Amino acid sequence: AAAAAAAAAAAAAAAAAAAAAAAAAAAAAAAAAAAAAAAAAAAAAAAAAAAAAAAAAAAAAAAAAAAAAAAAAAAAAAAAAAAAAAAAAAAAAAAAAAAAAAAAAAAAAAAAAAAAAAAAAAAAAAAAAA
Amino acid sequence: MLMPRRMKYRKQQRGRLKGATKGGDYVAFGDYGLVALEPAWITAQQIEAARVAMVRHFRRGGKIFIRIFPDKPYTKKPLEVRMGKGKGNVEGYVAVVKPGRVMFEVAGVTEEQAMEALRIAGHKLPIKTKIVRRDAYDEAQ
Amino acid sequence: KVRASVKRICDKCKVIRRHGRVYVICENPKHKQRQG
Amino acid sequence: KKVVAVVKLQLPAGKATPAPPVGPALGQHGANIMEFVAFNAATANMGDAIVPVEITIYADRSFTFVTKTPPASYLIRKAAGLEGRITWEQVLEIAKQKMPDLNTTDLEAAARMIAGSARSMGVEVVG
Amino acid sequence: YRLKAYYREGEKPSALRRAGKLPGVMYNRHLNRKVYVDLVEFDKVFRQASIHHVIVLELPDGQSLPTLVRQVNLDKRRRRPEHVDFFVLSDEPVEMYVPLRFVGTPAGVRAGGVLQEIHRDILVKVSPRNIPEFIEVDVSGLEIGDSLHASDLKLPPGVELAVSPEETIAAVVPPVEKLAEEAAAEVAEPEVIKKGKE
Amino acid sequence: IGRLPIPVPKGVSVEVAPGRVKVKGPKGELEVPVSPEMRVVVEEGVVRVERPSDERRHKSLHGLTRTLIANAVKGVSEGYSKELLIKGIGYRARLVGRALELTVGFSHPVVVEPPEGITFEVPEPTRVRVSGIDKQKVGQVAANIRAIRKPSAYHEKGIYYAGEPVRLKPGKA
Amino acid sequence: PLIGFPVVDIKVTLYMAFKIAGSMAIKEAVQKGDPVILEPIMRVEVTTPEEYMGDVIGDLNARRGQILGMEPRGNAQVIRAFVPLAEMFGYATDLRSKTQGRGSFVMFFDHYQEVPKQVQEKLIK
RNA sequence: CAAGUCUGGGCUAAGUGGUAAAGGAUGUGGCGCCGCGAAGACAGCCAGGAGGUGGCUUAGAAGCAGCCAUCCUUUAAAGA
């Protein structure tokens, strides 16, 4: 059986595009509002991406397979990862701290990230939004 | 129902249900078939009950192939008479069927349908039956 | 309830053997069977 | 005395009667169930076609309501002499009329939702 | 398609079958040798291969021969093979059975009704350099009566049919509303060919 | 199986014979039968159970045996519980002594003396909880109570487990 | 011919003495014409709190009916339908059981129409 | 009731053995040969399961009466 295949091929390209992957937990509200943080965070991020919400334990074995070195401060959990490798991001996360932070019982959480290429912390990133 | 239109002889001897099938044993037309696991005289009314149940199940659609044909006369003496006085009158007609005979065969329907239809029909038969698809039945040469 | 071919009727229906013999039970009680 | 609401009704064009579902859901609203028949002013233009609506109440016992666009199967029936066919542009015209609703904000995508609704009513798309 | 095959001397075809081995034979104008194969390995291959595609026979020595199956003899009771005749190919226009691929939706199935694939093979003369797979067949014209056949089929180069043609290869045919006229019918009265004087 | 390793807490002694296994603790002691086809004896900070072979007899008794234990261990650190709703008009429950007097529309109220090891509460007058060390006993008495006036079957009458019922949407009528 | 009730809804085209001939002609035409029994159908509108609608309608269908529609009237809800007069016996008390005595209904002759091929034999009787 | 409570390996748990068929069945043991599994659902469990919203008939058929068609959208993934 396949030990990391056509799903790595898409994640280790769409996330081997640049060096600013930002990681989040996003599954926990009605998809009306979910398919409108993802169609809405196109108003702050480029190409055609808000998140790739794909398999941790395949997001894990790609950030290592493609040299990009551990996002392993939060690589566990329900990991959605707002890929800003194909994006126009810096304060695009600044415009991602309202619509699912101050909206729900905490709808979209930060977790781990890459600033240019060296690794951005959790609260030193979360607070970086304001 | 189903019975010869003409005949040289009106009554025939009972004979035997022997091995084999002789022929009739690979599919040939449809995608699925119903094969006989035991010998038996299959009556015209059995074949018909079967065929009809077959069509109820695919209400419009599909084709049914009836590969057996009852051309053997079933005799039975009048009720409560004795032995002798000659051979009984024909009560009906049977098709002789030995193990491995493909009896029915359907096509033009889903697997779900043919399975289900052939199961029903085979419930109308006096014998154990198996259903089949199309393997080594490419029995051209 | 009591007959010779005991089959599952619905999806929730559950074949069980017990006290010797084969039962069925769906959540819907009409489907409750026993061989006999 | 009733509490708050975000009512998601679904009323057609013209016949606006306080009859349910404009009764059980809008009895906790104090809703002007006749300040809708506001509607046939904006849809005195159109004429037909259902118009979705969301009526929200507050504390002082006042109401509100914003409406979406008419069924995707509507504009397609008139654009074919139906109760026919539409070109690769006449599909790209309609996907504009409902682009602030569907989900996509494209037309290579949006049009296909319309082109899909083509075989939903048996109406070929002129190529 | 490969298939480990072996050589049979002169000992009782019952045993092999009993073992697990489908007894058989390869032959052609030149050759003729008794051989068995694994029944279980032979079934895996012959289900995809059928008589249509070439099966290669790897003997003990390493000699891989391409072969077509000419004949598989069944058991009747148990739809089960008893024997294979392997035809060993050479430099030859050989006669063989090539799949038709009925591709298209016939306009007479869309109109209710059924495609009866009379023939799923046609018998062709052809040299083993060019064994086609499919011979795909234009179907989509056929309305719920008419029935294309013979050579109304595109034949790739050097391929040429050793049938008639005329031999019918496909009909589309009519498919519960007629079970009343059927049940009613209850007619005829079986007639005995008059023997006798006259 | 669910032959994981169990987990002995605070003040539980876990004795062990060839056929049995005693479990002491803050809420009491319990004797727990066991197939001698498994070999458990008073084990570490946690109790573990193996089986000789992987026959079907065996696998079955495993887990069966681990659970029997485990329920015993939870019994003795407070494993009482499971409560009864009585639903419907005149129906209500009170304690008379330790014994339990349900009025449920029969002509006289029924009383239910609680067996050994088992205690009845009646917080509300229509909620009722059965409390014991054992477990299978709690279950048994739970059911005897329930079966005094079972639900439903056309109404929201009778006495229920907390964990809820269908109604048969019947002849109004 | 069948039960002996009036014959209706037919066009005769002609192409003491005269009397006996029409009388024996048509008497026969109706047999050769291969007849069918018609039976009164009442237009019914029943009025029910909406609670009960499904069961009410279900029972109308069970009465061999054909529902025609449903509007409100004030606090409750009306259902219009056609049902054969025959199956409408004791309707009011069946209805009252299905509506906890809150339903009412009214009934007016509407048309005649042929039967369900079950009766007739069970009506030549 | 004369001679093995003989030896080695299986099966059976019904007193089957020690009375019967179609048929039914997580009985049990064994042989297959296909899937799935460091692209960590097998089972439980926590989420999601959504847009276009469907054509027809029918009083009403809107994923679910029964008939034609199974076409896209945003997707992690959601069947007309």
Please enumerate in sequence order all residues whose Cβ is within 8 A of that of D84, keeping only pairs 6 or more positions apart, or say none: D123
Q: Reduced to 3 states, what is the DSSP secondary structure of residue A123?
A: helix
- Between the alpha carbon of residue D80 and those of residues A123, D90, D113, D118, the distances in Å are 58, 10, 17, 11
> Phi then psi for B43, rounded to 5 degrees?
-75, 155
How many domains does chain B contain in total? 1
Cα dist. B119→A42, B36, E131, F156 in Å? 57, 12, 40, 45
CA E147 to chain CA centroid, Å, is 21
Q: How far apart are CA D8 and CA E41, in angstroms?
A: 64
**Rounded to whole angstroms, how far apart are CA atoms D45 and D49?**
11
Asked, for residue B41, whether it belongs to a domain, the answer is yes
Q: How far apart are CA F92 and CA F157, in angstroms?
A: 11
Q: Is G38 helix (H, G, I), strand (E, B) or coil?
A: strand
Best CA proximity match to E36, nearest among E86, E99, E79: E86
Residue F168, C-beta contacts closer than 8 angstroms, at least 6 positions apart: F152, F153, F154
CATH (domain of B58): 3.90.1170.10
Report the C-alpha gap between A38 and A50 in whole angstroms: 5
Strand H closer than 7 A to residue C10 Cβ: no
List all residues 6 or more positions away from E88 whose beta carbon is below 8 Å from its beta carbon.
E26, E27, E28, E30, E31, E57, E65, E66, E67
Establish if B21 belongs to a structural domain. no
Contact G100 F171 (CB under 8 A): no
SS3 call for E109: helix
Resolution (A): 2.9
Residue of B nearest to E42 (CA): B136
CB distance E137 to E170 below 8 Å: yes
For residue F128, the tally of other CB atoms under 10 A from its CB is: 24
According to DSSP, the β-strands at C21-25 and C33-35 are: antiparallel
Residue B4 lies in a domain: no
Let me know: does F88 contact F125? Beta carbons within 8 Å: no
The sign of the torsion formed by the CA atoms of G67, G68, G70, G76 equals negative
Q: Are E175 and B60 contacting, i.e. CB atoms less than 8 angstroms apart?
A: yes
Residue F65: closest CA among F2, F134, F16, F9 = F2
Q: Which string of DSSP letters, residue by residue, matches chain D?
A: ------B-----SS---S-TTTTTSSTTTT--TTS---HHHHSTTT-SS---EEE---SSS---EEE----TTTHHHHTTT----B-TTHHHHHHHHTTTTSS-S-STTHHHHHHHTTTTTT-PBP-
Query: Assign residue G51 a region: left if phi > 0, alpha if psi is -120 to 50, beta otherwise?
Result: alpha
Q: How many Å apart are CA B1 and CA B5, to the nearest integer?
A: 11
| CA dist., res. A85 & res. A98, Å (int) | 22
Q: Is the dihedral of CA A30, A35, A41, A47 positive or negative?
A: positive
Q: Which residues make Cβ contacts (< 8 Å) with residue F162, sequence separation at least 6?
A: F82, F83, F84, F85
How far, in whole angstroms, is CA E78 from its chain's centroid?
19
Distance (Å) from the alpha carbon of F172 to chain G's nearest alpha carbon: 6
Closest C-alpha among B141, B119, B108, B95 to residue B29: B108
User: Residue E112, CA: closest nucleotide via C1'?
Assistant: H68
Query: Residue D71 in contact with residue D12, Cβ under 8 Å?
Result: no
* G91-98 and G53-62 helices, crossing angle to 10°: 150
φ, ψ for residue D89 (rounded to 5)?
Answer: -95, -40
Short-list G101, G74, G107, CA closest to G89? G107
Whether residues B100 and E97 touch (CB distance < 8 A) is answered with no
Beta-bridge partner residues of E36: E23
Report if residue B38 sits inside a domain. Answer: yes
Contacts of G99 in chain F (CB under 8 A): 172
Question: Taking the C-alpha atoms of D113, D117, D119 and D121 in order, what is their torsion angle to the nearest 10 degrees?
Answer: 180
| CA atoms within 13 A of residue B59's CA, in its CB half-sphere | 2
Closest nucleotide to the alpha carbon of D113, via C1': H72
Query: CA E140 to CA G86: how far, in whole Å?
Result: 55
- Please check if C10 is assigned to a binding site: yes
Say how many CB pairs under 8 Å bridge A and D: 5
Rounded Cα distance between A99 and A27, Å, is 14
Nucleotide nearest to B129 (CA to C1'): H22
How far apart, in whole angstroms, are the C-alpha atoms of residue B32 and residue B112? Answer: 11
Give Cα D46 distance to the centre of its chain.
Answer: 12
Chain D hits for A39, CB-CB cut-off 8 Å, are 103-105
- Candidates E151, E156, E144, E155; CA nearest to E168 is E151
**3-state secondary structure string across chain C:** CEECCCCCCCCCCEEEEECCEEEEECCCHHHCEEEC
d(C-alpha A96, C-alpha A89), whole Å: 11
Q: Identify the residues numbered 22 to 81 in chain D whose C-beta atom is closer than 7 Å to any atom of strand H.
A: 71-73
* Residues sharing a CB contact under 8 Å with residue B54, sequence separation 6 or more, in sequence order: B64, B104, B106, B117, B118, B120, B121
Q: Is F162 exposed, middle or buried (0-12, 13-18, 19+ CB in 10 A)?
A: exposed
**Distance (Å) from the C-alpha of residue B82 to the closest C-alpha of chain E?**
27
Nearest CA in chain G to F169: G55
Task: Return residues 39-58 of E near B (CB < 8 Å).
Answer: 46-47, 50-52
Listed residue (A69, A47, A58) closest to A119, CA to CA: A69
Structural element, H or E, at residue B49? helix B44-57
Q: What would the DSSP string read from start to end of E111-162?
A: TS-EEE-S-SEEEEEE-TTS--S-EEEE-SS--SS---BTT-S---TT-EES
Token pair 């051979």 is found at B87
Neighbours of A76 (CB within 10 A): 11
Q: How many CB atoms lie within 10 A of CB G4?
A: 5
Identify, with chain letter, the residue nearest to nucleotide H73 (CA–C1').
D113
Which H or E element spans position F63? helix F56-76
Orientation of helix B44-57 relative to helix B111-123, angle to 10°: 150
CB E122 within 8 A of CB E151: no
- Measured CA to CA, the distance from residue E3 to residue E65 in angstroms comes to 10
- In whole angstroms, give the CA distance from residue D115 to residue D95: 10
CB B121, CB B104: distance < 8 Å: yes
- E172, E115 Cβ separation under 8 angstroms: yes
Q: What distance in Å separates the CA atoms of residue F145 and residue F61, rounded to the nearest whole number?
A: 31
**What are the CA-CA distances from residue E113 to residues B30, E110, E175, G79 (Å)?**
14, 7, 5, 43
- Compute how many other C-beta atoms are within 10 angstroms of the C-beta atom of residue B10: 13
Give strand pairing partners of B132: B33
Written as six digits, the tokens of E68 are 């077509």
Q: What is the DSSP letter of B43?
A: E
Residues of D in contact with A42 (CB under 8 A): 105
Cα(F60)–Cα(E60) distance, integer angstroms: 50
Other CB atoms closer than 10 Å to residue G62's CB: what's the count? 11
Q: Is D114 in contact with D79 (CB distance < 8 Å)?
A: no
CA D30-D34-D36 angle, to 5 degrees, is: 100
Q: For residue A101, which phi and psi values (nearest 5 degrees)?
A: -105, -65
Contact E163, E151 (CB under 8 A): no
Total residue count of chain A as it appears in this document: 130
Q: Is residue B84 part of a domain?
A: yes
Report the C-alpha gap between B137 and B9 in whole angstroms.
Answer: 35
The β-bridge relationship of strands E94-103 and E135-138 is parallel
User: What secondary structure does DSSP assign to G54-69, as a single string?
Assistant: HHHHHHHHHTT-EEEE
Residues spanned by the domain of B121: 29-137
What is the bridge-based pairing of β-strands D65-67 and D53-55? antiparallel
| E contacts of B3 (beta carbons < 8 Å) | 188, 190
Q: Which of residues 27-46 of A touch strand H (CB under 7 A)?
A: 27-32, 34-35, 38-39, 42
Q: What is the distance in angstroms measured between the alpha-carbon CA of A79 and the sugar C1' of H45? A: 19
Beta bridge partners, F160, equal F85
Residue C26 Cα to chain centre, angstroms: 8
Q: How many residues does this entry show for chain G?
A: 125
> Amino acid identity of F98?
R
Residue B88 DSSP SS3: coil
CA distances from F118 to E70, F122, F135, F139, F148 (A): 81, 14, 10, 11, 18
DSSP H/E element including F71: helix F56-76
Q: Which residues are within 8 A (CB) of F156 and not within 5 positions of it... i.e. 6 or more apart? A: F87, F88, F167
Chains D and A touch each other (3 or more Cβ pairs < 8 A): yes
Are the beta carbons of A14 and A98 closer than 8 angstroms? no
| Helix (H) or strand (E) run with residue A6 in it | helix A6-14
Q: Which residue do the tokens 């129906």 mark?
A: F91
Residues ending a continuous segment of chain G before a break (C–N > 2.5 Å): 15
Question: CA separation (Å) from B125 to B97, B106, D46?
Answer: 11, 17, 67
> Sheet of B32-36: strands edge to edge?
B63-66, B102-107, B32-36, B129-132
What φ, ψ does residue B65 adopt, rounded to 5°?
A: -115, 125
Is E5 in contact with E25 (CB distance < 8 Å)? no
Please classify residue A84 by burial: count the beta carbons closer than 10 Å to its beta carbon, then call 0-12 exposed, 13-18 middle and 19+ buried: buried
**Through-space distance between the first and last CA atoms of chain C, rounded to whole angstroms:** 9
Q: Which residue of B has its CA nearest to E84?
A: B136
d(CA B45, CA B35): 18
Q: Is the separation of the CB atoms in A69 and A21 below 8 Å?
A: no
Asked if E177's CB is within 8 angstroms of B6's CB, the reply is no
C7 residue type, one letter: K
Q: Which of F82, F64, F89, F72 is nearest to F27 (CA)?
A: F72
Domains parsed from chain D with CATH numbers: 1-68 (3.30.1550.10), 69-126 (1.10.10.250)
d(CA C7, CA C27): 15
Question: For residue F168, which residues of chain G lie inside 8 Å, CB to CB?
Answer: none
Single-letter code of the amino acid located at E41 = E
Nucleotides of H under 7 A from a protein CB: 22-29, 32-34, 36-40, 47-55, 59, 67-78, 80
Smallest Cα distance from D80 to chain A, Å: 32
Contact, B57 vs E175, CB < 8 A? no
In a domain, B11, yes or no: no
Instruction: Please give the Cα distance from C34 to C24 (Å, whole number).
Output: 7
Q: Is F16 helix (H, G, I), strand (E, B) or coil?
A: coil
Q: What distance lies between CA C24 and its chain's CA centroid?
A: 2
Contact B6 E182 (CB under 8 A): no
d(C-alpha B30, C-alpha B33), whole Å: 7
Rounded (5°) CA angle B109-E184-G28 = 135
H/E stretch holding F57 reads helix F56-76
Q: Which of E104, E124, E126, E111 is nearest to E170 (CA)?
A: E104
Q: Is residue B20 included in any domain, yes or no?
A: no
